[PDB]
A paper describes a structure:
Here, we report the crystal structure of human [name], revealing a novel protein fold bound to a TEV site-derived peptide which mimics the conserved C-terminus of [name]. The structure obtained through selenomethionine experimental phasing consists of a new fold of α-helices and 310 helices organized around a beta-sandwich core in a unique topology. The last 16 C-terminal residues of [name] show no electron density in the crystal structure, indicating structural disorder. The asymmetric unit of the crystal contained two molecules that seem to form a dimer. The β-strand in the N-terminus of [name]ΔN (β1) is critical to form the dimer interface in the asymmetric unit and its amino acid residues originate from a plasmid-derived sequence instead of [name] itself (GHMAS), agreeing with the fact that the full length [name] construct does not dimerize. The density maps of both molecules in the asymmetric unit present a positive electron density inside the bottom cleft that cannot be accounted by the [name] sequence. This positive density can be correctly modeled as the four C-terminal residues from the TEV cleavage site, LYFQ, bound to the [name] chain A. The same peptide was bound to the symmetric binding site on chain B and stabilized by further interactions with chain A, which allowed for the modelling of the entire TEV site, ENLYFQ. The binding site for the peptide shows alternating patches of hydrophobic (I147/F150 and L141/L182) and positively charged residues (K171/R173 and R184/R200). One major exception is R200, which engages in ionic interactions with the C-terminal carboxylate group.
Residue numbers in the entry:
A (entry chain C): 11 to 14
B (entry chain A): 11 to 256
Amino acid sequence: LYFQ
Amino acid sequence: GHMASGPWKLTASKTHIMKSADVEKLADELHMPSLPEMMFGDNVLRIQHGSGFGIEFNATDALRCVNNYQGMLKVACAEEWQESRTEGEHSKEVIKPYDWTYTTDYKGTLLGESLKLKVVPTTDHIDTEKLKAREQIKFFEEVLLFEDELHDHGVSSLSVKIRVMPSSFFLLLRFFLRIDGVLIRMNDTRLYHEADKTYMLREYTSRESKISSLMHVPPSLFTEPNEISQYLPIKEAVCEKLIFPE
Ligand SMILES: [Cl-]
Ligand code: NI
C-alpha cells in the first residue's frame, strides 16, 4: 500500500 | 467515508455511476459529445482543514480540463460516435480536434469559502526518501472518478488514492490512458504534506509513449500502470507549493  | 485527525478531515464518497439523463445534460454543459461510460459524478476524495481551506478531487472538474468539441471530427472521421454542440471559446491556444480520450491535466479543486490555498512555483521536489520511509499507514483510501473503454479500443481512467501516516500524508491522482496497439499516456498528480509545514507539495508529471516504442516490454505490463510508468518518457513536469492561508 506504500505507493510511490 | 469519513476520517479525522486533528484539524484535518478526510472525506471519500463512493456511489453508483451517473444516470443517462444527467450524463447528457452535463455533456452539453461541457460541450462534449458524451461522458465516460462509467462516470462517478458523486464520487470524491476530499482533504479539508478546520479553517475551511482544502483540496478535493472529483470527476466533473476533471472533465472541464479536457479539450471539448471543436467540430473538426467532421473532417477527420467518416462517421462520428456522437455529435455535439460546438464549444463557444476560443483561447489563444491552437484549435485541436476532440479525440474521445478524456485526457485531463486536472490537478485537483481548491476549497475554501474565503481562506484558500495559494498555488506558487517551487524548485522543491517531493522527496522520495520520505515516500520510501515506512511508518504505519494510519489511513488508506482509493476512489475511482471515471472510466471509459474507448469503444473497446482500450481504457481511459481517472482515480485518486491517499496514504495517511502519523505525521504526513501522500496522495496520487492518476489519469491512465491506453489505446491498444497505439499508445500509453499517464498524467500523475502527487500531493505531499508534512505535519509541521505550512504548505503542501504538488508535483505533476505527464508521461506518454507510442506502444511501438514499448515492444521490448512484456505486454502484460501494458495493463499495469505502476509497472509501465518507468518506461514512459516525461513530456511535462511541474512542481508547485500550496501555501496555507494566514
Ligand atoms: Cl472536434
Ligand atoms: Ni499530517
